[model samples]
Target: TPLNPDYTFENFVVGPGNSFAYHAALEVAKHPGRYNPLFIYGGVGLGKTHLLQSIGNYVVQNEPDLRVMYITSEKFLNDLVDSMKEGKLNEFREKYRKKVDILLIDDVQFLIGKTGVQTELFHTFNELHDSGKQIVICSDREPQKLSEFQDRLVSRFQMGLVAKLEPPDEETRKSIARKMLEIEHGELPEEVLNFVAENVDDNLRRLRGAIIKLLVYKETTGKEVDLKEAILLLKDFIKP
Candidate 1:
């Protein structure tokens, strides 16, 4: 229930960049204990959070018995520290180990050098795994590359499905642009969409920003954006 309303599976655009991860997420969402802990790694803004939240959203929406808890590693660590300072460490452990069925933690890389946090997470992971609960973790890099983390924790991370989400391809970007337009009830021509998609080959967030800028420009000027003018309009977003 901690998931964003917009980060649902319905809105996630599947492409070559995230097809494998997407499918794996869906599988885990449908059958929680099957995947055990779905480890998803990706660059920022490439739908790692979206996909992680999507699983939580799916489970809570479809399966009534399964509980979902989504939190960032920073928050998890902070909570651990808070509980320790307050002499409620048992409550913190209980919340993670017994209170939730599907636990989704984002940006596990934030705990890279924090052994105390990693140690707590390692135990949380073991308890959840032993109980057949579903655990999903997202990181900026793969498990092995999470430098300074405990080898035991990293090994547990690799024990499950490790999936990577790359930046969406141009075609996927174009489709994502169209989907964003649909969400906003805005419009853009095929050429303009293609132009923006071809030029901005970074992450999805920037692609959304480009399309949003174009739509706003069109709305403000009451004119359609042409391919060349689109480049000029989105000059800041598009690389030379």
Candidate 2:
């Protein structure tokens, strides 16, 4: 499955903006097949992959008997095309249809306009779903907004519990910094945390980059950063 070992429920930071999607993921992982085809939508760097892999990790760890398959839609399409080229299309269909119990697809929006891939995926989805398999999909937008997708496919997606993750609020951003620091076994002064949280954009990739840069600076220089130094160090990431 190539699930990220670090992306688990213990490591995911929950906030008001992402709490609904987070809890829904937790529920689906805890009770596989309960929320059929749990659809999660969010913008980039908003923990879409994190939550998707978290589900995969949880299922793998706690449900040993269940088979989990996680792949981005891009990889799915690539493998499909490669199989067609190799005259092994049946093998590809068998692997996805018969060898999987819980299917997790990330960045499914990539299949929006690809009619061939979408057709194959639609059938695979139907086979797995009709058999009561658990399926989770992550997208940058909601299913209804996937205008290029087949209408029937979009309707099936809307049938399940659809969750959205929004940008975190200011305090949640601070908590995210603290969580990252905790994982790194590093500590920042409250003021510096506040400064980084306030100054950085809500996008977590930039926020974590700011934190990691600060951590690296301290590790190499052997000096704890003050709020002013953090502000100075992350000036590039800090918005006006």
Name the top TM-score candidate: 2
Cα deviation in Å at residue 224, candidate 2? Answer: 3.1
Model 1 lDDT-worst window of ten:
231-240
- Per-residue alpha-carbon lDDT of model 1 for 167-223, expressed as tens digits? 887778888888878877888887888888887877777888888998889988897
For model 1, the superposed segments whose C-alpha errors exceed 4 Å read 219-229
Give lDDT: candidate 1, residue 234: 91
Error of model 2, residue 39, in angstroms:
0.3
RMSD of each: 1.9, 1.6
lDDT of 1 at 145: 81
Report the alpha-carbon TM-score of model 1 versus the true structure.
0.92
Global local distance difference test of model 2: 0.89
Query: For residues 82-189, could you state the per-residue lDDT of candidate 2 as single tens digits?
Result: 998999999998889899999999999999889889999989989999998999999999998885899888888878889999989898888888888888788788
